[PDB]
Amino acid sequence: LKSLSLIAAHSHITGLGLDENLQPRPTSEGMVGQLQARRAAGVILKMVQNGTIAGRAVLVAGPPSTGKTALAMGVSQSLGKDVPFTAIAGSEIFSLELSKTEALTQAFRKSIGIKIKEETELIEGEVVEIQIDRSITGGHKQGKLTIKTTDMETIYELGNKMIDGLTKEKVLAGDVISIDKASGKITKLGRSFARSRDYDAMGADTRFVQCPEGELQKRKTVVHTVSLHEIDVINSRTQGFLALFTGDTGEIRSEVRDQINTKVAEWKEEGKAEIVPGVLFIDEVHMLDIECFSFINRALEDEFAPIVMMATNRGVSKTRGTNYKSPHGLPLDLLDRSIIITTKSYNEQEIKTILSIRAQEEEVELSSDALDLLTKTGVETSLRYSSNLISVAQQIAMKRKNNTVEVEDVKRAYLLFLDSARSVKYVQENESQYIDDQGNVQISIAK
């Protein structure tokens, strides 16, 4: 709900359709079919939740529009928040500023995450008054200041070094400030509400917050969800957060990676920081360069190797970077250390159920015979085409203003918008009309 509600390609699937025994219901959770694929995906998800072993890869095989991306994103949704999920593309990794090996290093680093906890001891209390004998005795006379809270109030002595500290961040009392118990650093939060009427207009500094409630100093632990890659960036540069936001990582050297791994191990054995299993997904990996393949093969054996998800619809074809072909357009070395999942095209029942759920997601009311003819189009055309057809038919219906989408409505929508087959036929029969590949096209109309 916190993200955009705009209807994406798959706005109807939320999580995984499996049960506790990993048995998929035929129509559940928003995704239909792929029972074997659903069970395998749930196996992978359960193993990720286990996280006891790593350094494994998984790939899904199927034609376009079969649900590879749908299954991947449903697995990601069922994974839930606070578990680091990284989704990248095989094309964006080709960076003109970053080495592809270095980019893949960050891609692996972002997938794994770490939880770090920290305990704080600070003194919180509204100041009542401050009295320093700076003239009768001068020289840090160790004045007394009274600090109040909604439940308790005490007076605190001020030392010479405390006199110098309070000389900075000057407070005239009537103001809520807090001082760390350990480091003695005082933070000026904001005045009391009684100061709201001192002047009509104040700057951005003055604030009027409530008096702190309870005891004076309190103990609180803070847990942070911080993955490895951002720690690498912040350690690489004096100010690494700006490089994190802007992306100017500067090709972090591997020399600090061993140091950060040792620090992570130290925090793990100390219990300060714990790791969280992560998932990496890459779509359309069939296009990729052989250096990336070799680096993936190398990095898959490292201890810090999250599960890696691949999607590919290519048959036995040539790999980019080499002249020769290979199965799936991918080297057999990757196929050696991988598990492959097969996905198939949906049948007319699955297609009509998908159309119905997509129309429900689009909030587009339909007719039974209209649904039947849309399913006929979807089986003759591709599945992604009938969804767009019904999308356009919704606005054509509201143009007609007669509630549900009509049969003639879908017929006119199909007539107005060409299918891929009709487009290819029109191109072939009018190759003279179009600018051909060779660069020749007939401009004159009269013969």
Partner 1 sequence: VTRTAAHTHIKGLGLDESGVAKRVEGGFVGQIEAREACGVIVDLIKAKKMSGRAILLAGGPSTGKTALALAISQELGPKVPFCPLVGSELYSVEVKKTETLMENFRRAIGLRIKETKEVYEGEVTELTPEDAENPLGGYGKTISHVIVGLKSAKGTKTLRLDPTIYESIQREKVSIGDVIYIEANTGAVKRVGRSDAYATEFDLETEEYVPLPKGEVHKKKEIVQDVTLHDLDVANARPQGGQDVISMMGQLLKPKKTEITEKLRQEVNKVVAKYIDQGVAELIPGVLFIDEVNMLDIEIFTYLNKALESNIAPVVVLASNRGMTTVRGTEDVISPHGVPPDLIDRLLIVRTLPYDKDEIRTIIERRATVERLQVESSALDLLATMGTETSLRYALQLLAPCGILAQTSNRKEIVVNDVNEAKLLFLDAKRSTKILETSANYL
The least distance separating Mg ion from the CB of residue 68, rounded to whole angstroms, comes to: 6
CB within 8 A of 84, min separation 6: which ones? 110, 111, 112, 113, 227, 276, 278, 279
Would you say 69 is a known binding-site residue? yes
- Residue choice 16, 58, 70, 166 for contact with ligand ADP (CB under 6 A): 70
Q: Taking CB under 6 A as the rule, does residue 69 contact ligand ADP? A: yes
**What's phi and psi for 145, nearest 5 deg?**
-125, 140
From 141, 430, 424, 110, select the one nearest 278 (Cα to Cα).
Answer: 110
Q: What CA dihedral angle connects 372, 376, 382 and 383, to 10 degrees?
A: 20
Q: With respect to partner 1, which residue has the nearer C-beta, 18 or 370?
A: 18
Q: Which two tokens stand for residue 209?
A: 């917050």
Report the 10 Å Cβ neighbour count for 89.
Answer: 13
Q: With respect to partner 1, which residue has the nearer C-beta, 91 or 210?
A: 91
The least distance separating partner 1 from the CB of residue 319, rounded to whole angstroms, comes to: 13
Q: With respect to ligand ADP, which residue has the nearer C-beta, 13 or 397?
A: 13
The least distance separating Mg ion from the CB of residue 17, rounded to whole angstroms, comes to: 19
221 binds, among partner 1, ligand ADP, Mg ion, none (CB under 5 to 8 A by kind): none
Q: Taking CB under 6 A as the rule, does residue 127 contact ligand ADP? A: no
Q: Which two tokens stand for residue 420?
A: 């891929």
Would you say 218 is a known binding-site residue? no
Would you say 331 is a known binding-site residue? no
Q: With respect to partner 1, which residue has the nearer C-beta, 368 or 444?
A: 444
Q: With respect to ligand ADP, which residue has the nearer C-beta, 36 or 196?
A: 36
Distance between CA atoms of residues 54 and 75, nearest Å:
18
Burial of 347 (0-12, 13-18, 19+ CB in 10 A): exposed
Three-class secondary structure of residue 33 per DSSP:
coil
- Residue choice 253, 325, 384, 422 for contact with ligand ADP (CB under 6 A): 384
Report the 10 Å Cβ neighbour count for 230.
Answer: 17
Q: Can you spell out the DSSP letters for 224-254?
A: EEEEHHHHHHHHHSTTHHHHHHH-------T
The least distance separating ligand ADP from the CB of residue 5, rounded to whole angstroms, comes to: 18
The least distance separating ligand ADP from the CB of residue 111, rounded to whole angstroms, comes to: 20
The least distance separating ligand ADP from the CB of residue 77, rounded to whole angstroms, comes to: 12
Give the residue at shortest CB distance from Mg ion. Answer: 69
Give the residue at shortest CB distance from ligand ADP. Answer: 67
Distance between CA atoms of residues 6 and 391, nearest Å:
14
Residue with tokens 């019904």: 390
Pairing between strand 279-283 and 85-89?
parallel
- Residue choice 10, 148, 286, 314 for contact with ligand ADP (CB under 6 A): 10
Q: Taking CB under 6 A as the rule, does residue 261 contact ligand ADP? A: no
Please give the single-letter amino acid code of residue 359.
A
> Is-contact 367 348, C-beta < 8 A?
no
Q: With respect to partner 1, which residue has the nearer C-beta, 117 or 253?
A: 253
Footprint on this chain of Mg ion (rule: CB under 5 A):
69
Q: Taking CB under 6 A as the rule, does residue 338 contact ligand ADP? A: no
67 binds, among Mg ion, ligand ADP, partner 1, none (CB under 5 to 8 A by kind): ligand ADP
Would you say 26 is a known binding-site residue? no
Q: Taking CB under 6 A as the rule, does residue 311 contact ligand ADP? A: yes
Three-class secondary structure of residue 304 per DSSP:
coil
From 365, 372, 368, select the one nearest 349 (Cα to Cα).
Answer: 372
Distance between CA atoms of residues 206 and 203, nearest Å:
6
Would you say 24 is a known binding-site residue? no
Q: With respect to partner 1, which residue has the nearer C-beta, 94 or 272?
A: 94
CA geometry: angle 110, 113, 118, nearest 5 deg: 135
How far, CA to CA in Å, does 388 sit from each of 410, 411, 433?
11, 13, 28
368 binds, among Mg ion, ligand ADP, partner 1, none (CB under 5 to 8 A by kind): none
- The annotation places the binding site for ATP at 62-69
Specify binding-site residues.
62-69
Q: Which residues bind ligand ADP (CB under 6 A)?
A: 9-10, 31-32, 34, 62, 64-70, 311, 313, 354, 358, 383-384, 387
